[PDB]
């Protein structure tokens, strides 16, 4: 027809693997008890770098679903996604053999895919020669393989792609899945993000950009909005969500955890590695999410800020939040706990926003003790506020001028 | 409301930089005269590789829009996109200062971004040390930067992202832009793809996978559907299209070249580096495009095949085409000319499909002389057929099980 009927999109389950937990309970446990996951880099000899802290996953449940041989097949970035997606499926009680697999899609966002494999194989190539590049290199490295792997693991035949917008990647991944089910192209979506770039190269890259915090004290390294913030801390991990059409969830009596109601996407089109100091594009991004969500500024009870713990970020971000929502709405950045997961940021912060609602609890911004003079946003720190959160948003601002905002509605 | 009104999406201009031309006329000139762009690799010392041919751009119009300093800012993969997008804008007479820049978005797909910069900087890191990684490394390398750069260059404030599905990347990029304008989220879109992976590493990677043709004769290296095909040839370049809502094009009296009417996206969810031997997912992908296009198999007058010139690809692809459309509809793979542009494949093959329509000409599949016994599709070779092409589709099948099909309608 000339028209397309809209559907409501709900979250029925989610999985996660991060520096602060490999299950929803552990994960949320860490947030509510203020237990951060930042510590000394153990993944490699950082003795020569300017950065010595990172949020690693040092207790990854490998045996649960994998066998040693799987390391010749997937890079950590893919392992994380697979695990997360499985947990999400187990959590959503989604029986994939009961699914209309053509309406079943997967979208796994990522900023740099298997950068570790790339680094390694590039050395092999230049040490031993072309004849020495492992055949499974590209299948492990290519940024889209996670999407395929997750799809291959659950027989999803629907829409399958990976989106890349740096730090905003998984926020855009969930948004596209949102729009997809909403306009009726798919019924179920496995969507989230994964990152595994705590490699010498990735760190060397961001350090050269001077974006990584050099603070030696793991507890003052990631302090979003704090006047002493000097860069973001690299984290690693993946977060997967299972989205379905309201109609589909009900038809199988699934347990709705929350609901996706808005998605804003804009581009600063200004600075190439930073967001507008005045959050010009971020503002519109928020307005767009709210517009789609048909709700107004006042109804927003919580904002999970990008809060990368960088001077420029928090300046622009607080600005835009105050411009649209105000100085009353609670603002916290959980990157203070998990570090910056980059392509996986959006996904994990969505789980934070969702659980926050399901617990009537606004998680704090760990480490933060003295907010910058100029930040007029109601930043939460020291400890977490208990509050009824009917509507909440989660922001992400990637390098390149990418802005993405997801709007959620607590389930009735 | 409960509903969303749909819009028609039209193409008003396109730009391109490839091994067979850096302008629409030159580009189409090469296709109609059977002039392929494959030749000996000149980008690096391939004396030690098993592959010696690639489709390079050796006459890239650098001075037209760039200054030497821009090489410290962008990797070739971004330069290509910028040039292509500019040509597309110049071609579409799109005055960006007349635009409602919030309804103006950019989506540049890519499979591996600035892999060249990554390779180089990874060596620097391990030669000289961390303190030696160039600060502009990530801004040049990250797969999403092209999207941002193109957005930054034309003030697009709308939707801005990069999609990654390997060989199907720019086909999915145009599809998302299609859906975006169609459901009224944007009015104008700068969308296409770019690839610049003719580097020692990229080649070493695919060669290890045994996906690259080892045929020394540049003219028999890329022979889609030919019984002697032994792998695909790596190409490089970018193709950008300017899409607008029918209503927007008319409102400024733009010149409509063609129209986007369908988009199918599915995942094989079978083999991790190849498409189903029976093209199970490819079929549905086509059916989906046709379904959205509200047209039937018979109305399709041309199919621009993925035709990667690999045994497995053409087998599954011909199968699916014959299963849905039949053995009558003309089938040609222009990768025989340009090589496989990967993330840029979709974009450039769309320009081929569009021009094909605007010229009532079905371009041939260069090099191909003896089609495989088992291929029952009406493959075009030896020379090009003249035919009225009212509706045509263009396919792409990336590693990971990604399938994407774009449907076009010749403009009335
Ligand atoms: Mg800091
Ligand atoms: Mg956030
Ligand atoms: Mg061949
Ligand atoms: Mg094609």
Tokens representing residue B313 in the block: 């690809």
Which phi and psi (to 5°) does residue B284 adopt?
-55, -35
User: Are B400 and A161 a contacting pair, CB within 8 Å?
Assistant: no
Q: How far separated are the first and last CA of chain B, in Å rounded?
A: 32
Tokens representing residue A250 in the block: 């009900």
Contacts of A292 (CB under 8 A, 6+ apart): A261, A262, A263, A264, A407
- Strand A160-164 relative to strand A104-109, pairing: parallel
Cα dist. A334→A225, A237, A349, B350 in Å? Answer: 12, 14, 7, 43
User: Are B306 and B379 a contacting pair, CB within 8 Å?
Assistant: no
Tokens representing residue B208 in the block: 């290890």
Contacts of B298 (CB under 8 A, 6+ apart): none
User: How many Cα atoms sit within 13 Å of B81 on the Cβ side?
Assistant: 37
| Cβ-defined contact of B142 to A272 (cutoff 8 Å) | no
Contacts of A82 (CB under 8 A, 6+ apart): A65, A66, A74, A146, A149, A150, A153
- Provide, as residue numbers in chain B, all residues whose Cβ is less than 8 Å from the Cβ of A1: 6
* Three-class secondary structure of residue A54 per DSSP: strand
CA distance B216 to B20: 20
Cα dist. A298→A295, A362, B263 in Å? Answer: 8, 17, 39
* Three-class secondary structure of residue B246 per DSSP: helix
Q: Give me the numbers of helices (H) and strands (E) for chain B, helices first please.
A: 14, 16
Contacts of A161 (CB under 8 A, 6+ apart): A107, A144, A147, A176, B163, B164, B165, B172, B265, B402
Technique of determination: X-ray
| Cβ-defined contact of A144 to B400 (cutoff 8 Å) | yes
Tell me the CATH architecture of domain B9-262: 3-Layer(aba) Sandwich (3.40)
B21 DSSP assignment: B
DSSP B345-360: HHHHHHHHHHHHHHHT
CA distance A216 to B130: 18
CA distance B15 to A138: 29
User: Are A228 and A377 a contacting pair, CB within 8 Å?
Assistant: no
User: Are B406 and B393 a contacting pair, CB within 8 Å?
Assistant: yes
CA distance A52 to B24: 52
A109 DSSP assignment: E
A69 DSSP assignment: G
Q: Which ligand is nearest to the CA of B215?
A: 3
* A93 among annotated binding-site residues: no
A113 DSSP assignment: S
* Three-class secondary structure of residue A121 per DSSP: helix
* B72 among annotated binding-site residues: no
Cα dist. B233→B170, B317, B334 in Å? Answer: 18, 18, 12
Domain ranges of chain B: 9-262, 263-407
A16 DSSP assignment: E
* A378 among annotated binding-site residues: no
DSSP A377-397: SEE--SSPEE---SEEEEEEE
CA distance B25 to B45: 32
With b meaning 16 or more CB within 10 Å and e meaning fewer, what string describes A268-283? bbbbbbbbbeebbbbb
User: How many Cα atoms sit within 13 Å of A25 on the Cβ side?
Assistant: 1
Exposed (0-12), middle (13-18) or buried (19+): which is B297, by Cβ within 10 Å? middle
Q: Which ligand is nearest to the CA of A335?
A: 2
**Is B267 known to be catalytic?**
no
User: Are B407 and B303 a contacting pair, CB within 8 Å?
Assistant: no
User: How many Cα atoms sit within 13 Å of B214 on the Cβ side?
Assistant: 9
| Cβ-defined contact of A399 to B272 (cutoff 8 Å) | no
Distance from CA of B381 to the nearest CA of A (A): 32
- Phi-psi category of B181—alpha, beta or left, where left has phi over 0 and alpha has psi -120 to 50? alpha
Contacts of B293 (CB under 8 A, 6+ apart): B261, B262, B391, B407, B409
Which residue, A342, A348, A372, A364, is CA-closest to A143? A342
Contacts of B362 (CB under 8 A, 6+ apart): B302, B330, B332, B356, B380, B384, B385, B386, B387, B389
Cα dist. B209→A135, A136, A411, B116 in Å? Answer: 5, 7, 48, 19
CA distance A241 to A19: 18
Distance from CA of B384 to the nearest CA of A (A): 34
User: Are B281 and B401 a contacting pair, CB within 8 Å?
Assistant: yes
Place of tokens 């989610």: A14
Q: Count of residues for chain B?
A: 412
Which residue, B149, B236, B238, B239, is CA-closest to B199? B236
User: Are A84 and A15 a contacting pair, CB within 8 Å?
Assistant: yes
Fold match between B9-262 and B263-407?
A: yes
User: Are A317 and A306 a contacting pair, CB within 8 Å?
Assistant: yes
DSSP A283-330: HHHHHHHHHHHT--GGG--EEE----S-HHHHHHHHHHHHHHT-SSSE
User: Are A278 and A316 a contacting pair, CB within 8 Å?
Assistant: yes
* Three-class secondary structure of residue B46 per DSSP: coil
Resolution in A: 2.6
Interface test with B, best of A164, A200, A285 (most B CBs within 10 A): A164
Place of tokens 């767009």: A288
Of B151, B176, B400, the CB nearest to A145: B400
Please give the CATH topology (third level) of the domain spanning A263-407.
Answer: Peroxisomal Thiolase; Chain A, domain 1 (3.40.47)
DSSP A202-248: HHHHHHHTT-B---SSHHHH--TTBTT---BPBB-EEEEEEEEEHHH
For B66-157, list the strands marked E by DSSP.
104-109
* C-alpha A401, offset from chain centre: 17
CA distance A70 to A347: 24
State the DSSP H helix or E strand holding residue B27, giving kind and residue range, or none if neither: helix B24-32
The catalytic residue among B54, B167, B190, B300 is: B167
| Cβ-defined contact of A5 to B3 (cutoff 8 Å) | yes
Say how many C-beta atoms besides its own lie within 10 A of residue B153's C-beta: 18
HEC secondary structure over B186-235? CCEEEEEEEECCCCHHHHHHHHHCCCECCCCCHHHHCCCCECCCCCECEE
* Three-class secondary structure of residue A260 per DSSP: strand
Which phi and psi (to 5°) does residue B167 adopt?
-60, -20
CA distance B140 to A48: 24
Which residue, A158, A162, A180, A153, is CA-closest to A107? A162
Which residue, B247, B253, B89, B109, is CA-closest to B181? B247
Contacts of A239 (CB under 8 A, 6+ apart): A14, A15, A16, A17, A18, A84, A170, A192, A193, A194, A341, A344, A347, A348, A350, A351
DSSP A328-375: SSEEE-THHHH-B-GGGHHHHHHHHHHHHHHHTEE---TT--SB-TT-
Which residue, B312, B267, B293, is CA-closest to B394? B293
| Cβ-defined contact of B267 to A105 (cutoff 8 Å) | yes
Largest CA distance in chain A: 63
User: Are A157 and A100 a contacting pair, CB within 8 Å?
Assistant: no
CA distance A145 to A163: 12
State the DSSP H helix or E strand holding residue B302, giving kind and residue range, or none if neither: strand B302-304
Q: Count of residues for chain A?
A: 412
| Cβ-defined contact of B118 to A118 (cutoff 8 Å) | yes
With b meaning 16 or more CB within 10 Å and e meaning fewer, what string describes A147-171? bbbbbbbbebbbbbbbbbbbbbbbb
- Strand B378-379 relative to strand B361-362, pairing: unpaired
Tokens representing residue B35 in the block: 């002039």
Say how many C-beta atoms besides its own lie within 10 A of residue A23's C-beta: 14
Of B145, B209, B402, the CB nearest to A161: B402
Of A135, A151, A165, the CB nearest to B144: A165
Tokens representing residue A294 in the block: 């048909």
Which phi and psi (to 5°) does residue B229 adopt?
-60, 130
Residue A365 Cα, ligand 2 centroid: separation in angstroms?
12
For B322-379, list the strands marked E by DSSP.
330-332, 361-362, 378-379
CA distance B391 to B411: 10
């Amino acid at each position: 027809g000339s028209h397309m009927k809209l559907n409501r999109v709900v979250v029925t389950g989610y999985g996660v693997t991060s520096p602060i937990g490999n299950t929803p309970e552990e994960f949320w446990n860490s947030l509510a008890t203020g237990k951060i996951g930042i510590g000394g880099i153990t993944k490699f000899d950082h003795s020569d770098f300017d950065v010595h802290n990172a949020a690693e996953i040092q207790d990854f449940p490998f045996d649960k679903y994998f066998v040693k041989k799987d390391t010749n097949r997937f890079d950590n970035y893919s392992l994380y996604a697979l695990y997360a997606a499985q947990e999400a499926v187990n959590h959503a009680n989604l029986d994939v053999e009961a699914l209309n697999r053509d309406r079943f899609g997967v979208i796994v966002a990522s900023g740099i895919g298997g950068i570790k494999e790339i680094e390694d194989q590039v050395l092999r190539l230049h040490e031993k020669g072309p004849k020495r590049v492992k055949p499974m290199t590209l299948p492990k490295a290519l940024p889209n393989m996670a999407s395929g792997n997750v799809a291959m693991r659950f027989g999803a035949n629907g829409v399958c792609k990976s989106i890349n917008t740096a730090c905003s990647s998984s926020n855009d991944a969930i948004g596209d899945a949102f729009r997809s089910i909403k306009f009726g192209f798919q019924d179920v979506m496995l969507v989230g993000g994964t990152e595994a770039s705590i490699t010498p190269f990735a760190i060397a890259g961001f350090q050269a950009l001077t974006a990584l915090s050099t603070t030696e004290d793991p507890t003052r390294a990631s302090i979003p909005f704090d006047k002493d913030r000097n860069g973001f801390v690299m984290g690693e991990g993946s977060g997967m969500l299972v989205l379905e059409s309201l109609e589909h969830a009900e038809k199988r009596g699934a347990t709705i955890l929350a609901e996706v109601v808005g998605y804003g996407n804009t581009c600063d089109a200004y600075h190439m590695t930073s967001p507008h100091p005045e959050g010009q594009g971020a503002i519109k991004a928020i307005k767009l999410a709210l517009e789609e969500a048909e709700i107004s500024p006042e109804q927003v009870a919580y904002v999970n800020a990008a809060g990368t713990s960088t001077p420029a970020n928090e300046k622009g971000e607080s600005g835009a939040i105050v411009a649209v929502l105000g100085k009353e709405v609670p603002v916290s950045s959980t990157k203070s706990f998990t570090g910056h997961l980059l392509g996986a940021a959006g996904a994990v912060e969505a789980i934070v926003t969702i659980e926050a609602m399901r617990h009537n609890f606004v998680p704090m911004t760990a480490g933060t003790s003295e907010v910058s003079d100029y930040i007029e946003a109601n930043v939460v720190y020291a400890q977490g506020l208990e509050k009824e959160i009917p509507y909440a948003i989660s922001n992400t601002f990637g390098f390149g001028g990418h802005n993405a905002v997801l709007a959620f509605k607590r389930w009735e």
